[PDB]
Amino acid sequence: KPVQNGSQLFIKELRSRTFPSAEDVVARVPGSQLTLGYMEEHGFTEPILVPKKDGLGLAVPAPTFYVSDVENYVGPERSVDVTDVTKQKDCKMKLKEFVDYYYSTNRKRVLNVTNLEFSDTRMSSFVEPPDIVKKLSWVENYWPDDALLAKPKVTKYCLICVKDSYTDFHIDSGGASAWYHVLKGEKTFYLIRPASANISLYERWRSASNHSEMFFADQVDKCYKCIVKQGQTLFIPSGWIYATLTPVDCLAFAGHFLHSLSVEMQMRAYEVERRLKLGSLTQFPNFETACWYMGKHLLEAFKGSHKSGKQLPPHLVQGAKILNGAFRSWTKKQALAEHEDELPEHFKPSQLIKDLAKEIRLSEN
Ligand SMILES: O=C(O)CNC(=O)C(=O)O
Ligand SMILES: [Cl-]
Ligand SMILES: [Fe+3]
To answer: Do the two domains 1-286 and 287-365 of this chain adopt the same fold?
Structure first.
């Protein structure tokens, strides 16, 4: 009998496996140093661990905040997605019910909540994402507060994982980057770099009928183990393929964002996830819409480069090329139908595309 991912035996095997340490890959950085300058210099191509929250501008409740507290501020009747780790299947249930299980003295099942976005609850005011995320985020910067399309609801997640919880290898939707803060307990990440072959292997693995029977890390050269302890915050870059294991009961907060340093990888991940057709519950809503607003921003910046005679940085110009390629593919008449639903009000795609194309020609010279 083949071992299924998430099963009791798998977890035992996994705990015994040795992995290269995240030491050579994950930078340890003090919160006050994680600046926009730092991101630009290093380019956010590898995860970053911030051992203490000081300097991050991160707002979170004290460690004396419990799952019972989440129930109160979120709402006991609130429906939630619950993952049965051993089956590797998802279901729905009231939060009060999950909480009743969580506090059970003899849990039979291994169940977690890893999709609870609480920006629309009373608990929202208790959590504020790190300053660096707000500075990098496309939605935070370029999506108007008066927009008719609702902003992607991906900014404040509460994760509750019991001991022995496992989340299998995945790339986050939209190739989005993540901040992940452990309030109580600890969370182990197994991190795989999005080198081109690795992404291709991931796509082939995720699309295979027997994928829940195969340990993905067996197929790549390096899978790095990174333990994130209480009070620590991990920043995961675009496109990284990762799984997690929960060694002790864990409560954590996280958010997802897109940014200008990984336009290429963001599109690549999006293309992969579109080919996979997972119809996820964790999909990045209105990813295309965020790209459209980025596109309008770039056109404005280019126009602004003509008033100063100061050219845009090369990564933006390249970002423009990649986005403009997307806009074209999304609006070819053979395509409109499904993609038009994400177009913001008052956008004229064929004009934007032509204006961006011209501006890029001029920038190149
Ligand atoms: O909490 C976990 O173990 C898994 N979390 C996620 O993959 C995430 O927040 O995007
Ligand atoms: Cl964003
Ligand atoms: Fe994830």
So the answer is: no
Closest residue to atom 3 of ligand 1, CA basis: 244
- The set of residues, in sequence order, having a beta carbon less than 8 Å from that of 36 and lying 6+ positions away, is 132, 135, 136
CA-based nearest residue to 161, from 119, 118, 110, 92? 110
Asked if residue 167 lies in contact with residue 209, where contact means CB atoms within 8 angstroms, the answer is: no
- Which numeric CATH code is attached to 287-365? 1.20.58.1360
159 lines ligand 1 (CB under 6 A): yes
Residue 317 has a CB neighbour count (10 Å cut-off) of 18
Q: Does the CB atom of residue 326 touch ligand 1 within 6 A?
A: no
Token reading at 52: 């203490």
Q: Which of 180, 233, 235 should be mutated for ligand 1, with most atoms under 8 A from CB?
A: 180
Domain extent listing, the chain: 1-286, 287-365
Which ligand does the CA of 157 lie closest to? 1
- Interhelix angle 349-364/314-331, nearest 10 degrees: 150
